[PDB]
Amino acid sequence: RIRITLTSRNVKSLEKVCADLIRGAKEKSLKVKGPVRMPTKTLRITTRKTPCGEGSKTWDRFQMRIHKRLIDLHSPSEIVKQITSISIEPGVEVEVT
């Protein structure tokens, strides 16, 4: 069995390649496990706005979304090589195992 994870930065492009992967896999009559929704991790960086000591203690709250989706697949690796080459888009990282 092969477990391919999907770690991305945008949710709109994550669920797109995730749905395009399971559709490209279920059409080959393969046992695909459901998309596991890993908890998202935000990257908080509270930086002072002004590059000096003048201000009213105004801070800048930054964030960065990190979404991970797990996809398992029990099938030979020869049938999954071409499937991994059709759902590749910028913003999402593919980790085949």
Contact residues for another protein, defined by CB under 8 A: 7, 9, 41, 43, 45-49, 51, 56-66, 68, 88, 90, 93
Query: Which partner from the list RNA, another protein, none does 88 bind, CB cut-off 5 to 8 Å by kind?
Result: another protein
Measured between alpha carbons, how far is 68 from 3 in angstroms, rounded to an integer?
13
46 or 77: CB nearest RNA = 46
Residue 11 interaction partner, one of RNA, another protein, none, beta carbon < 5-8 Å per kind: RNA
Closest-CA residue to 85 (of 37, 30, 20, 36): 20
**C-beta separation of 87 from 23 below 8 A:** no
Residue 32's beta-bridge partner residues? 73
Which parts of 16-55 interact with RNA (CB under 7 A)? Answer: 33-55
